[PDB]
Amino acid sequence: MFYGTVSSPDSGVYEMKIGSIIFQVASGDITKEEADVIVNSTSNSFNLKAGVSKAILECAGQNVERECSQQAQQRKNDYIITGGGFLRCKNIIHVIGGNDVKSSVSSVLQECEKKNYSSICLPAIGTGNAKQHPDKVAEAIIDAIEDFVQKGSAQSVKKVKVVIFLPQVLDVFYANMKKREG
Numbered sequence: 001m002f003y004g005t006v007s008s009p010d011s012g013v014y015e016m017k018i019g020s021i022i023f024q025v026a027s028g029d030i031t032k033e034e035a036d037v038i039v040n041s042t043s044n045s046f047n048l049k050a051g052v053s054k055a056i057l058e059c060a061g062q063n064v065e066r067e068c069s070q071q072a073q074q075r076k077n078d079y080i081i082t083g084g085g086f087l088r089c090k091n092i093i094h095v096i097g098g099n100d101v102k103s104s105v106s107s108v109l110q111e112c113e114k115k116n117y118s119s120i121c122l123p124a125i126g127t128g129n130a131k132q133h134p135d136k137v138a139e140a141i142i143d144a145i146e147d148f149v150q151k152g153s154a155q156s157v158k159k160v161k162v163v164i165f166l167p168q169v170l171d172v173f174y175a176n177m178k179k180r181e182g
């Protein structure tokens with residue numbers, strides 16, 4: 001009902017259409033990416049510096065660290081939105097790695113539509129210190145996008161890219177895309 005064909009538009013990049021959205025996966029350093037939103041997979045205190053979260057907070061800078069700790073004390077948050085600091089983005093959305101991944105990605109998509117944003121870049125949420133299994137994480141990320149498209153919610157969002165630290169985890173995402181393709 002929604003899925004296009006898997007292909008490689010550039011060396012090390014794999015893509016398929018999901019309704020009006022281009023979904024892409026690649027391995028590399030997410031802190032070098034440019035997008036309207038970059039997602040950080042962190043702890044329930046929004047102050048983890050282990051796995052990909054270490055690089056994201058180091059590169060974003062101390063003003064972003066302070067935004068995180070101020071919001072964390074204000075109320076009980078499932079996720080928080082901060083400035084981009086010294087990353088190449090308009091906002092960082094910090095999600096909890098241990099939470100349900102489909103729910104976290106659904107929230108990111110909704111928040112990006114609220115800001116009229118077009119591009120998102122995320123890591124393999126939950127596969128760091130939270131130790132969720134990579135095939136369950138790939139299934140959840142792609143399911144969230146399918147549901148968002150099915151409900152007619154994609155208007156401003158046009159591109160969702162997963163940049164993945166470990167090549168072995170990229171292989172799991174690519175196999176999940178091939179399972180779904182038209």
Ligand SMILES: N#CCC(=O)NC1CCCCC1
Nearest residue numbers: 041051052123124127128165
């Ligand atoms: N987000 C996310 C995924 C993440 O942090 N992954 C770790 C796995 C161990 C090596 C360093 C990167």
Ligand SMILES: [Cl-]
Nearest residue numbers: 097126128130
């Ligand atoms: Cl994690």
Ligand SMILES: [Cl-]
Nearest residue numbers: 123124164165
């Ligand atoms: Cl990752």
